[PDB]
Amino acid sequence: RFLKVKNWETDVVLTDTLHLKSTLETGCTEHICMGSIMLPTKDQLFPLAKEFLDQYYSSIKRFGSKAHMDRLEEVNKEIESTSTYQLKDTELIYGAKHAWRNASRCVGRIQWSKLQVFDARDCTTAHGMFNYICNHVKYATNKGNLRSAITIFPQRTDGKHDFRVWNSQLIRYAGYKQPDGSTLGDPANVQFTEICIQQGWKAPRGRFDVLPLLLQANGNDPELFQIPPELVLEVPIRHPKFDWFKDLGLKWYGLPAVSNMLLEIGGLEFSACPFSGWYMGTEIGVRDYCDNSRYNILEEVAKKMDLDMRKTSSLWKDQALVEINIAVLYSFQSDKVTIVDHHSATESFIKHMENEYRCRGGCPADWVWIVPPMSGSITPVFHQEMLNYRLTPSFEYQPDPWNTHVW
Amino acid sequence: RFLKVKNWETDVVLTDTLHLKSTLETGCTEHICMGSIMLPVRTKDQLFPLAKEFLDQYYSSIKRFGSKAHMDRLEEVNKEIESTSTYQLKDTELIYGAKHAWRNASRCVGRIQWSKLQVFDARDCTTAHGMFNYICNHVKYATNKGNLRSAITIFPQRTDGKHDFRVWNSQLIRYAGYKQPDGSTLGDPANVQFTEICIQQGWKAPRGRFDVLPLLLQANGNDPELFQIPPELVLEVPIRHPKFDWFKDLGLKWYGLPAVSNMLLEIGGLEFSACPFSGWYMGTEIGVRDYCDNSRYNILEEVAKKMDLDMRKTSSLWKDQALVEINIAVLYSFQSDKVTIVDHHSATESFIKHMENEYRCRGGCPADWVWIVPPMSGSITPVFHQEMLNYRLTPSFEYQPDPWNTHVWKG
Numbered sequence: 080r081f082l083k084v085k086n087w088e089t090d091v092v093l094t095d096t097l098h099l100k101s102t103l104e105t106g107c108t109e110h111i112c113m114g115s116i117m118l119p120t121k122d123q124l125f126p127l128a129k130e131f132l133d134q135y136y137s138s139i140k141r142f143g144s145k146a147h148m149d150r151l152e153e154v155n156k157e158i159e160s161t162s163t164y165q166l167k168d169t170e171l172i173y174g175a176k177h178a179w180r181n182a183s184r185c186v187g188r189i190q191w192s193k194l195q196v197f198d199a200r201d202c203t204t205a206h207g208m209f210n211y212i213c214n215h216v217k218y219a220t221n222k223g224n225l226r227s228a229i230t231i232f233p234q235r236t237d238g239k240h241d242f243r244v245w246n247s248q249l250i251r252y253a254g255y256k257q258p259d260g261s262t263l264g265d266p267a268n269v270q271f272t273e274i275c276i277q278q279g280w281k282a283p284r285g286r287f288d289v290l291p292l293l294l295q296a297n298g299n300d301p302e303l304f305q306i307p308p309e310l311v312l313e314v315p316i317r318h319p320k321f322d323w324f325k326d327l328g329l330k331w332y333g334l335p336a337v338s339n340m341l342l343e344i345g346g347l348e349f350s351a352c353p354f355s356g357w358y359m360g361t362e363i364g365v366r367d368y369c370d371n372s373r374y375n376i377l378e379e380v381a382k383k384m385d386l387d388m389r390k391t392s393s394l395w396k397d398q399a400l401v402e403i404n405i406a407v408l409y410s411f412q413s414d415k416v417t418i419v420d421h422h423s424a425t426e427s428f429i430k431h432m433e434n435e436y437r438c439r440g441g442c443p444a445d446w447v448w449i450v451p452p453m454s455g456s457i458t459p460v461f462h463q464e465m466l467n468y469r470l471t472p473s474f475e476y477q478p479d480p481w482n483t484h485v486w
Numbered sequence: 487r488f489l490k491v492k493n494w495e496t497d498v499v500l501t502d503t504l505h506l507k508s509t510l511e512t513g514c515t516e517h518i519c520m521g522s523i524m525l526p527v528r529t530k531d532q533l534f535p536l537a538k539e540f541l542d543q544y545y546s547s548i549k550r551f552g553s554k555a556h557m558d559r560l561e562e563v564n565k566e567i568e569s570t571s572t573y574q575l576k577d578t579e580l581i582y583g584a585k586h587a588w589r590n591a592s593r594c595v596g597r598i599q600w601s602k603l604q605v606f607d608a609r610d611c612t613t614a615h616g617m618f619n620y621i622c623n624h625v626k627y628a629t630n631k632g633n634l635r636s637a638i639t640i641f642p643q644r645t646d647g648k649h650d651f652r653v654w655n656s657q658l659i660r661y662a663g664y665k666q667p668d669g670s671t672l673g674d675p676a677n678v679q680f681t682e683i684c685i686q687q688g689w690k691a692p693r694g695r696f697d698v699l700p701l702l703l704q705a706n707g708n709d710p711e712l713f714q715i716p717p718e719l720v721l722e723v724p725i726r727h728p729k730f731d732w733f734k735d736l737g738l739k740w741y742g743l744p745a746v747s748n749m750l751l752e753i754g755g756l757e758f759s760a761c762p763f764s765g766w767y768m769g770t771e772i773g774v775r776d777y778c779d780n781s782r783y784n785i786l787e788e789v790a791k792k793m794d795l796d797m798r799k800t801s802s803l804w805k806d807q808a809l810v811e812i813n814i815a816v817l818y819s820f821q822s823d824k825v826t827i828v829d830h831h832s833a834t835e836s837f838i839k840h841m842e843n844e845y846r847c848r849g850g851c852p853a854d855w856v857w858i859v860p861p862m863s864g865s866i867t868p869v870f871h872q873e874m875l876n877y878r879l880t881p882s883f884e885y886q887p888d889p890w891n892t893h894v895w896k897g
């Protein structure tokens with residue numbers, strides 16, 4: 080019931096009680112661990128509201144005050160009546176910050192409480208959503224000095240009137256299958272790129288074409304909008320030592336902005352809630368560039384380095400991987416775009432876990448995601464035992480819209 | 487109930503039915519995953535069901551299930567249990583058992599090799615000197631002048647829990663660690679405590695950076711006894727780098743034979759508390775963990791110094807750079823000296839093929855992702871992208887408490 084986690088590098092032992100509040104389920108049982116699986120009414124709504132408001136009012140040291148009981152009463156009456164309810168701004172901001180705070184897969188959560196929340200609940204049209212989004216993009220980008228932000232669109236009502244951003248991130252590169260056989264641009268987005276095209280987008284058909292937004296307001300057919308190029312900050316990728324690196328023609332965008340998730344606060348569902356922070360280097364250089372099903376450029380870089388690609392045991396892949404990642408970090412830093420390396424992010428997270436164990440009685444963490452995709456054991460999080468559990472408010476996955484939408 | 491795992495690189499989806507034969511528990515519940523926790527005297531009562539399920543599995547594997555021999559064997563084991571409270575395994579069931587425990591080891595990336603396991607039956611062993619003799623033969627056989635062969639030596643099983651056979655060492659071959667009065671460590675920091683136990687039992691420590699520890703061996707619940715492994719039996723590899731000539735001057739070497747000696751082999755409810763086994767190294771075990779863990783030899787700084795990398799910011803990735811160079815060196819040295827080693831690309835690719843084969847023939851392959859994914863270059867190996875299901879099958883290898891914590895000293 081009180082659980083211990085050990086750091087095997089430092090012997091530091093933390094005790095976890097926060098897990099006893101865990102409300103959602105994990106995927107696992109006593110017989111099988113599913114830790115590495117990627118994805119594992121009025122009646123229902125009032126307990127969910129209560130649990131949230133109880134934690135909200137405890138967080139402001141007003142648990143069991145007349146203010147607390149009154150709001151519980153007020154929300155109760157509103158559920159009874161409307162079959163839903165509305166968050167106060169204060170609750171909304173709290174809800175959003177806490178969803179980040181509870182994101183067990185996020186290494187960057189030391190930052191959780193500095194989150195700019197843009198309340199777009201008054202939004203009604205796809206054009207409005209586009210305006211909100213461009214404002215968010217410009218605010219968060221801050222000419223390279225990035226700030227965390229979330230923009231929250233109206234909450235699900237009857238599931239017929241959902242707001243959705245069909246994009247997976249606000250800024251992403253197009254991917255095109257070729258007669259050729261292979262793939263131009265980003266293979267992760269081939270399907271979304273076709274959905275745009277089949278909705279009307281004139282594709283430049285390049286390697287690094289910023290996708291148009293596909294925005295759905297109020298359950299309508301989604302619409303296309305080009306993010307003003309002037310708002311999309313990009314970084315040309317060069318190496319501090321290899322001059323030929325530039326000639327690979329690589330670039331990436333400064334702003335990581337996930338837009339296909341669902342934010343749940345007190346049982347209410349916010350199906351359009353694009354949020355952004357800034358990149359850890361490995362996300363671009365390890366995953367985006369080197370995944371076989373992504374830009375997959377390892378082979379080409381190794382060649383330019385004249386490495387022995389005859390045997391896996393020369394560690395040419397590994398040698399090239401490190402160089403690609405040095406280059407990503409160097410380019411972002413050169414151009415003054417905020418970026419974090421995996422050593423610094425993971426060091427931060429250990430300090431954050433320490434703070435949370437101390438102030439909150441724990442910190443849900445998914446080791447499989449927290450440990451970076453390169454140099455695992457030379458980062459401190461490798462040696463850190465973590466307990467994974469699901470707390471609310473939360474961000475959740477949801478089915479890609481085109482499978483759902485009654486077109 | 488069927489369970490699916492997807493590989494997110496290849497889209498290959500596999501179906502798991504084997505997890506239905508799983509008995510032991512995981513640590514996890516519907517409310518908490520303990521997948522990153524390092525560690526998550528039997529009656530007749532619990533013994534016969536464990537023996538029965540085991541012999542049912544053995545008889546099935548030899549296509550004799552329900553045969554007269556199967557039935558006569560169950561009856562004979564049962565009789566032996568109620569009369570003696572325990573039972574002896576036939577040679578063949580021991581072999582099958584030891585192989586299955588390897589096949590079932592969800593944290594082992596080397597399991598493609600599970601069926602080629604040389605089993606040495608040391609159950610007639612009675613004394614610590616007898617144990618030393620068995621272990622030398624094991625080491626010499628497994629080593630095979632650099633052409634490493636998998637092996638396990640199986641000493642007598644637990645009886646009343648007061649007559650245990652144990653190898654106190656954590657691996658048969660390991661280097662001493664010495665905590666110095668300024669607080670610095672000499673040799674391998676992992677083995678300090680045990681080094682200290684050996685000293686106290688009377689080992690005369692050479693006190694170098696790579697002193698092979700002596701064997702501390704307990705027979706029949708008696709106090710353990712020291713022995714030195716003949717040096718001619720300890721194959722070692724000096725570490726050098728193909729392009730960096732100063733690498734040799736770091737004075738590094740490692741031993742060739744990874745031989746884990748502190749686990750417990752469970753087969754059909756029986757407990758083999760001394761069951762040392764060995765394979766060969768995956769390069770990252772030495773190059774990443776043994777050399778570059780902060781808590782181990784910790785050579786990253788000195789290597790990056792010699793490479794004259796930019797060490798003033800972590801964002802130069804000097805650490806990642808030194809790490810690759812050290813690991814290139816470990817593989818280069820082993821291959822040059824013709825001592826078996828596998829790199830992490832080769833091993834993980836083999837594992838993916840082993841796993842798919844196992845899903846097809848066995849209906850599953852329990853696998854611990856946290857452990858299978860290599861401690862460097864995780865996502866450029868195919869395992870990273872492979873969903874895995876972790877569950878516990880018997881026969882199995884289990885942890886046990888360090889014996890200095892539990893032993894009743896005779897004096």
Ligand code: HEM
Nearest residue numbers: 179182184185186187190227228354355356357358359474
């Ligand atoms: C400020 C800088 C931030 C850093 C460096 C960062 C770092 C990361 C990284 C590296 C991942 C794993 C990504 C992957 O491999 O796909 C991640 C996951 C995640 N982070 Fe962050 N994060 C940041 C800010 C945010 C913010 C602002 C939110 C929301 C308010 C957020 C919520 C999440 C969620 C929900 C996940 C998991 C998504 C999933 O399960 O697929 N993070 N974080």
Ligand code: HEM
Nearest residue numbers: 588591593594595596599636637763764765766767768883
């Ligand atoms: C033949 C070559 C082998 C290779 C390359 C190999 C590879 C590995 C590696 C890399 C690990 C994780 C090591 C660590 O990070 O501490 C491991 C774990 C393990 N392997 Fe092997 N293995 C081999 C043979 C064997 C053999 C012969 C057995 C026993 C019969 C075995 C049973 C295990 C077990 C039980 C574990 C998990 C130990 C734990 O939980 O601490 N493996 N294997």
Ligand SMILES: Nc1ccc2ccc(CCNCc3cccc(F)c3)cc2n1
Nearest residue numbers: 117187247335337355356357358359362
């Ligand atoms: N730097 C940041 C900041 C916030 C982030 C939030 C979420 C993610 C994850 C992106 N999700 C895409 C995805 C990844 C893996 C499986 C899947 F289904 C979908 C990365 C972040 N990276």
Ligand SMILES: Nc1ccc2ccc(CCNCc3cccc(F)c3)cc2n1
Nearest residue numbers: 524596744745746764765766767768771
């Ligand atoms: N190459 C091989 C072959 C077989 C192996 C069997 C077991 C192990 C694991 C040994 N672990 C030592 C250890 C060190 C630190 C903490 C801990 F729990 C365990 C590695 C193998 N490595």
Ligand SMILES: C[C@H](O)[C@H](O)[C@H]1CNc2nc(N)[nH]c(=O)c2N1
Nearest residue numbers: 115116117447448870871872873
């Ligand atoms: C199969 C496995 O769960 C999957 O590849 C995971 C592993 N860890 C990850 N970790 C992070 N941060 N991001 C990911 O996309 C993944 N993918």
Ligand SMILES: C[C@H](O)[C@H](O)[C@H]1CNc2nc(N)[nH]c(=O)c2N1
Nearest residue numbers: 461462463464522523524856857
């Ligand atoms: C806390 C964490 O589970 C622990 O560091 C594990 C992680 N994965 C590992 N994986 C392997 N192969 N070996 C290890 O010693 C560890 N250590």
Ligand SMILES: [Zn+2]
Nearest residue numbers: 107112514519
């Ligand atoms: Zn689990």
